[PDB]
Structures are given as C-alpha cells and as structure tokens.
Design a protein around this nucleic acid. Structure first.
Ligand SMILES: NC(=O)c1cccc2c1O/C(=C\c1ccc(O)cc1O)C2=O
Ligand SMILES: [Zn+2]
Ligand SMILES: [Zn+2]
Lengths: 222, 456
DNA sequence: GCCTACCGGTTCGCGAACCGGTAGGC
DNA sequence: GCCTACCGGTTCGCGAACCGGTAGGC
C-alpha cells in the first residue's frame, strides 16, 4: 500500500541497492517498493539506513508515509523522525499521551525479546494454537502476535467471515476470506476478544507477568 | 490449444493429451483492491510455465526438460493443484482463496462494390483495433478461443452486477462480481488497477464488449473453414460463406431514389454532429429468410425501418440474420427488454455504426419488419411477455416522420416524411423505436454504405 | 511468480575402544 | 596351570553430510 518500508533486517542476507553490501541481521534498514520485472507484484529495494538518505529521497512525515514505523522501537522511531528532516489541557493530554505511547511501545518490546530469550519458536507456535489463534509465517511476526495476545487478549474470530484479525500499524485488520474470490475488509481499533489463557507449562510466566502489566487497551497514533 | 512460442520449441514437439483431458491450462487471478491482475499458463510438451501481469512485459517463464514422461504427470498435476487449488479431474470447479482460476479455452467474378463489402466486413485486424478501446487482451485472444459456456457465465456476472447496482447492494457483493468478471475475461489495464463495475452504464459497456467480441469469433469461424480446392477465388470463398444473395442497386434506379430520399429526409435535428452521404445501395436476400417470413406476410402493418450496428457485427448479421440478445445477458441499455430494435430515422440508427473522423465508412440496414398490432409505450419499461393480441412494441417519440407522406414500396409502408410533432408529448423518448420479440418477424431488404462528414 | 540460504532432524561414516577368543611362553 | 602380546569383530560417540519444508529475496 505504502511507497516506503522500514523494519529490522529479518535476515542478514539481502544486499543494499546503493553500496551493494550485505545488510546485517536485526539492523535498521529502509526500503522503497518498486514493480518487479519478473512477476506481477511489488518488491522492496532494501537500503542501509545510512545509505537511504544519499539517494535523494525526502520523506516529509515518516509516520504517515513509511510502513512499519509504529512497529519499530520508540528510540529508533525518533532516529527516523529526526534524520527525515536532516492550550493548557490540550497540550497536557497531548504530552501525557505520548508518555503513555512510549510506555506501551517499549512494554511490548520488553515482552518480545523476553520471549526470544526464554522460548523457542515451537513454544510460541503452540502458545497461539492453544488460544485458538492463526499461526503466522515468520519469526518476528510470531512473537509480535504472542506479545499482542498476552498484553491485550486472545482475538476472537471475525463477525462475518470468521477469520483472524491482525494488528497492522494503526488498526486491527481482518485477514480472513468473505469469499474465495475476494479477501475480507473488516477494520477496527476495538476488536472483540476473550482473555489470553497461558497453558500450565510456564516456569517463567511469573517473571514475564511480573513486569508491572495491568489491564489496558491498545493505544493508537494521533 | 497449440504450443506457446515462448518456449521456443513450438514447431518441434506436440502438446500432449491423455485420451480426453488435454495437458494444458491457462489460469488467471485478479484482486481489484491489491491491483494484481495476472496470468499463469501451464503446459506439457518437457514442462512449460509462463507467468506475469496480463498485457505487459512484466513477467517471466521457465522451460524445463523432465527426467521421464511419468514424472511429467507428477510435476504437472502438482504444479496445477499448487496454483489452482483443485485436482486435475473434477465434477465441478471451485475457486480457492488467493489461488488461481482456470480459463476455459477451446479472377473473382463479382462486382467491385461487393468485393469492397467483403473487404470491409472480413478485415479482422480492423475488428482487433475495435476491441483495443474496450481494453480486452490483444495478445492471445485471436488464437485462444474463449469458450461458449465461459462467455455465458461472463454475461451472467454482468447481469448480477446490474441487479446488485439497482437495489444498492454491498460493496463486497459488487467487489466479488468485478473480480469474477476480470478473472473470467482477461483485460489489459497495464500498470493500473482494474476499475470496479459500480455504474449502470459500465455493465452496459462490458455487455456491448461481449456482444462485439462474440461476433469477431463468429467472423473467424466463417473465415476459417470450407473446402480449400483450387477452383474458386479467395473473395468468392468468403462470399459463399455469408450465405446470402447480395446485389448492387444502381444509382439510376427509381427505387434507389427512394432510399436516398429516406436517408436525406429522416436525419435528426438533434444529431447535427455529422452529415450522411450514401456511397452504395445493396439489395440483400438471406438464405431462407423468405421461407420463415411467409407467416408474417399475412400480418398487417408492415414497415420498412432502419437498423444500424458496428461494421464488425455485419459479418455475423448476414450469416445468421438479426438475433435477439441471449437470456443470460443483462437488460441494461435496452429500453423495452431484449429484442430487435428499429428506427424510422436513418440518423438514430446510424449512431450504432460507431464511426469517427479517422474511420469514416459505415454500414446500416433496412428491413421489412412485420409490426402488426402494436403495443404503444411512452416511458421505458422492461417487458417480459407481450399483452394479448400484440405482435410488437412501439416507443412513442416527440418527432415522427410525416404520416400523411408515407410512401409504399412492394407492399411495405416506408415513412420517409420529414419530422413533425407527435400526437402525445408525455413521453421520455425524442424519436420512435420499433421492437420485435421474434427473429422471424424481421426480413432484411437493403444494406447501405454511408460516409460521415464531421466538423473538426 | 521462482530461487535458495537457513533451520531442525535424522542419518551416515569411520576411527577409537571395548571385548572375548586364542596360541606361544614360562 | 597361569600370563600376555596379538588379532577379528562388535559397539559407541560425534561430527560431516544429507534432506524436505519454508521464510526471506528478488
Ligand atoms: N440498432 C440500432 O441502430 C437502433 C436503432 C434505433 C433504436 C435502437 C437501436 O438499438 C437500440 C438499442 C440497443 C440496446 C442494447 C444493445 O446492446 C445495443 C442496442 O443497439 C435502440 O434502442
Ligand atoms: Zn549501503
Ligand atoms: Zn472478516
């Protein structure tokens, strides 16, 4: 949908379009989506984050233009936001929300790499299956949904198509199939969901849940 | 079908088939939201895979020799199911999420004007260009004959869209039919998204496309065939295929003056965009059209009326006569339901020739249509069955050719008078329409050739 | 669309070593 | 009757090699 794309390298395999060296794994990298000559579909042109700003591209507002911006770590978002460039109650709720937005951002990130330290992929796969959740493709995406599941809740099936809703940047989009020909287009910020039930098998669940985690709903960007 | 030349082994090894089922399928997949609009041709020559975005250089292919012939079936049926979702054999097909859907593939002794008539109505490259504006795939549609059961389903989808549009159905309901249609009939939009079929005239535009597309494949069906023996001439072979007796009415003829009067007189005051000019007059006599019309020569109130259509259609109109729209097709565009439409004015009919400043020449018909006891209507009304004792329907217009100047012709009433006001003015029609709901009631008399003069 | 580097899961290959049967010496 | 230097054969341990399914790349 978007022109640009930012994420942490899913593998240290892809090369950089400008300098032509291997972009290392788990490193901040930016892309520009182009039409593939070989097939009917868009393809990312990966750049080193350092090399991205010398090609001549100037993203005015990263959060609205670049994809995967909200999924980044809070301090890394500010690096993109700064490098892109080179009343009482109103400002209070405005400033206090950004405090709570960082609070939510690095809460999930603490929870994410906590599970990466303790659990393998097969544990995280069987975590989602127990909660009646669709197991996604990808390592990063699996713990992203497990972290989403634990913090907010196990997502109930869709109203019409009975598919799986997924958090994407600014809302929960349905990824099911209303029919064989067309994909479902349900979208919401307040989806239906029962509480996340961790199985008995969790000797480090008391450690992860001990990180001052109370009941709260997903906060979104302005 | 035959071998795809993208392999490079087209005239070397034949495409294989196991008894009945031919090991070759052309798949398609479109998602209007994503914008994807792709093809996927699979064959078993060696196995060959072709893929890309329909109607563009985007895509690639892979020719690959097999270890053996039984491994071919294994590789073919596996690739098939992986891409389409279903097995190679099935009682009825079912589409699957993000999987593809398979598309169902199947010295001349005559006058100079008559030779030009065949030259005009059998030039198929002119018919190809005619489809380019519709955005039908130009690449492999001439060699790849799209099935009859397929096009009937394509018609059915269009009729479902009009039904969905009429009663303000869901966007998803519309999205599905728009997806379904472009998958079933491959279009060429290039690098931009397929547009949604949400309008009332968009379905009519795509309905007209199918009508034209059908007649081109019919024109091919005539052209391809016969008995290729060294005796007759190339133009004569195509003449005999039309199955009609065409004659040139001379300009000195007295009956020819009536037609030129009928052209000159009945030009519309509102249709002042162009100016007609009769190049030729042809007297036309179809094979056994008098045998079927004998019943209606007993019928009263017979009128000689205009009927225009694309130059592409006249290849099929001569061979099969004037035909009513199929039952699967949508009723959109038609004023009073499916049937043969006629006008008393040459101009109103002449608009259906579809001519431009670049393409000036065009063809228009004149048929003895037995109207009989007429059912007169003012406003538009989609009828299914006629009232009792009524053999035709009339759309009452504002302007009508002078009824006190209605000249006769071989026992047929020719209304070639100029325009005057009608008896009733509470109608939503500017000019008259004559409708028959039976192909037997029409009997084609004359075929004209007209030059159009615009101002640009 | 296809290609392929990566992942886990099992197998495979080969040398150390373990072990029991044995025949030349006293 | 002992002991023991020598040899054929089974087991064991661990890293190389193999492999099918797949997430990432173009
Ligand atoms: N054929 C003619 O020259 C013509 C003349 C006068 C009136 C009509 C004609 O055609 C009509 C409707 C029509 C309706 C649907 C369609 O697909 C094609 C059509 O021509 C008409 O309503
Ligand atoms: Zn670089
Ligand atoms: Zn849904």
């Amino acid at each position: 949908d978007k022109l640009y794309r930012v994420e942490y390298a899913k593998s240290g395999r892809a090369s950089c379009k400008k300098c032509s060296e291997s972009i290392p794994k788990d490193s901040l990298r930016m892309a520009i989506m182009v039409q593939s000559p070989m097939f009917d579909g868009k393809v990312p042109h990966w750049y080193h984050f350092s090399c991205f700003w010398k090609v001549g591209h100037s993203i005015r507002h990263p959060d609205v233009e670049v994809d995967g911006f909200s999924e980044l770590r809070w301090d890394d978002q500010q690096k993109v936001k700064k490098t892109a460039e080179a009343s009482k109650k109103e400002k209070d709720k405005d400033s206090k929300l950004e405090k709570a937005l960082k609070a939510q951002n690095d809460l999930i990130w603490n929870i994410k790499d906590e599970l990466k330290k303790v659990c393998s992929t097969n544990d995280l796969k069987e975590l989602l299956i127990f909660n009646k959740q669709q197991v996604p493709s990808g390592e990063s995406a699996i713990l992203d949904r497990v972290a989403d599941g634990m913090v907010f809740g196990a997502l109930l099936p869709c109203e019409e198509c009975s598919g799986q809703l997924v958090f994407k940047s600014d809302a929960y989009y349905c990824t099911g199939d209303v029919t064989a020909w067309t994909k479902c287009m349900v979208k919401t910020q307040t989806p239906n969901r029962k509480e996340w039930v961790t199985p008995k098998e969790f000797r480090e669940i008391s450690y992860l849940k001990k990180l001052k985690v109370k009941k709260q709903d997903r906060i979104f960007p302005p | 079908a035959a071998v795809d030349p993208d392999s490079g082994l087209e005239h070397s090894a034949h495409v294989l088939e196991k008894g009945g089922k031919v090991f070759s399928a052309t798949l398609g997949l479109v998602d209007i939201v994503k914008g994807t609009n792709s093809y996927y041709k699979l064959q078993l020559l060696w196995i060959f895979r072709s893929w890309g975005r329909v109607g563009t250089v985007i895509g690639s292919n892979k020719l690959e020799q097999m270890p053996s012939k039984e491994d071919a079936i294994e590789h073919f049926m596996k690739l098939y199911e992986e891409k389409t979702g279903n097995a190679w054999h099935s009682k009825n097909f079912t589409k699957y999420p993000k999987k593809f859907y398979p598309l169902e593939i199947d010295k001349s002794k005559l006058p100079k004007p008559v030779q030009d008539l065949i030259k005009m109505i059998f030039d198929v490259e002119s018919m190809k260009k005619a489809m380019v504006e519709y955005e039908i795939d130009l690449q492999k549609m001439p060699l790849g004959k799209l099935s009859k059961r397929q096009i009937q389903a394509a018609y059915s989808i269009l009729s479902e869209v009009q039904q969905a549009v009429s009663q303000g159905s869901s966007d998803s309901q519309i999205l599905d039919l728009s997806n379904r249609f472009y998958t079933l009939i491959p279009h060429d939009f290039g690098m931009k998204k397929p547009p949604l079929l949400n309008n009332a005239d968009s379905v009519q535009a795509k309905v007209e496309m199918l009508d034209n597309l059908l007649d081109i494949e019919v024109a091919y069906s005539l052209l391809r065939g016969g008995s290729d023996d060294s005796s007759k001439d190339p133009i004569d072979v195509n003449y005999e295929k039309l199955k009609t007796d065409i004659k040139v009415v001379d300009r000195d003829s007295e009956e020819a003056e009536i037609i030129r009067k009928y052209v000159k007189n009945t030009h519309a005051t509102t249709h002042n965009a162009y100016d007609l000019e009769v190049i030729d007059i042809f007297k036309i006599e179809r094979e056994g059209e008098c045998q079927r019309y004998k019943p209606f020569k007993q019928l009263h109130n017979r009128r000689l009326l205009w009927h225009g259509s694309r130059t592409t259609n006249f290849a099929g109109i001569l061979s099969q006569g004037l035909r009513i729209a199929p039952p699967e097709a949508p009723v959109t565009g038609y004023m009073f339901g499916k049937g043969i439409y006629f006008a008393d004015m040459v101009s109103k009919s002449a608009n259906y020739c579809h001519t431009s400043q670049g393409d000036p020449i065009g063809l228009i018909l004149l048929g003895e249509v037995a109207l009989g006891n007429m059912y007169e209507l003012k406003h538009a009304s989609h009828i299914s069955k006629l009232p009792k004792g009524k053999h035709s329907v009339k759309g009452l217009g504002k302007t009508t050719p002078d009824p006190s100047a209605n000249i006769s012709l071989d026992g047929v009433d020719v209304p070639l008078g100029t325009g005057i006001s009608s008896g009733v003015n509470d109608t939503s029609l500017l000019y008259n329409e004559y409708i028959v709901y039976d192909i037997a009631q029409v009997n084609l008399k004359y075929l004209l050739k007209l030059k159009f003069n615009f101002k640009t």
